[PDB]
DNA sequence: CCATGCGCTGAC
DNA sequence: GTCAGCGCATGG
């Protein structure tokens with residue numbers, strides 16, 4: 001993460017829904033806000049959250065009464081995506097996991113916070129010919145909010161990863177906010193090779209298979225794009241190998257292949273997948289965050305997560321607007 | 328629960 | 340024709 005000297009959100013309160021590792025909390029806390037409620041149902045995720053922040057998040061949101069939730073200023077939610085991703089089937093609103101937005105809508109109707117900050121995958125902006133995005137937009141206008149949405153790629157904000165996502169921000173109409181804007185892009189000066197750990201700390205992650213079909217040469221100069229070097233098996237998901245001189249591919253939660261959930265990379269002559277700490281780093285987490293002791297569950301958590309740096313520049317821009325109240 | 332071979336869809 | 344995805348399905 002980045003350091004913030006000007007703390008634009010000092011007296012505001014917010015809630016962490018679909019908490020996961022607490023990516024939204026780290027970001028909003030560095031700007032000065034305070035957390036008064038958190039929710040998440042996975043046994044193991046609750047263990048890490050507690051290890052780092054000190055509290056246990058409430059369970060299943062579908063059976064919690066919206067009237068018991070504390071008063072607050074900003075609502076945060078990175079809702080589920082299996083039903084909208086380009087890698088899965090595409091059932092959408094007909095999916096048992098695709099109805100979560102309506103619970104946000106339900107909680108929003110009672111507490112009426114000032115800001116709503118949500119995140120989901122790129123294909124959500126294009127799913128069902130745009131009907132899904134419109135249902136979200138119109139439901140939001142009906143509740144008396146304005147709707148701003150956009151797709152930002154992480155390689156444009158300082159992190160070496162090709163993770164594309166849609167961020168949605170909405171302000172209550174009494175406020176009359178007319179100057180909100182998404183952060184501007186800038187040049188990348190850090191690459192995958194600058195986040196890696198020493199060779200000794202790994203060894204056990206190396207893979208020597210006899211399918212290595214080198215199909216390109218190692219490049220000699222850095223570049224902000226994924227550069228493919230070879231294939232294993234049939235070159236399907238998890239059997240593709242990349243150069244440590246470009247950027248990482250999107251980390252995932254339920255992925256497969258011999259180089260599962262992280263992909264494979266050519267390092268000092270050998271091919272291997274990434275370590276949980278290198279996963280923390282390509283996602284913007286600080287070395288002081290404690291990861292779960294089960295490596296298998298650690299990989300699933302970083303893959304469902306959110307990149308801190310981008311949430312930080314966006315949050316700062318929410319506060320600037322709330323603070324511009326001239327006579 | 329953990330490991331790993333797959334096969335289709337979207338935006339060039 | 341090329342290439343990538345906060346995934347799905349099946350075995351122990």
Ligand SMILES: Nc1ncnc2c1ncn2[C@@H]1O[C@H](CSCC[C@H](N)C(=O)O)[C@@H](O)[C@H]1O
Pocket residue numbers: 018019020021022023024039040041042045059060061062078079080301304305306
């Ligand atoms: N019915 C439900 N009630 C409560 N939590 C739920 C839920 N369905 C899914 N979840 C949780 O929703 C999360 C979606 S992914 C969100 C990740 C988070 N932004 C990050 O910083 O890590 C998962 O952790 C999932 O376990």
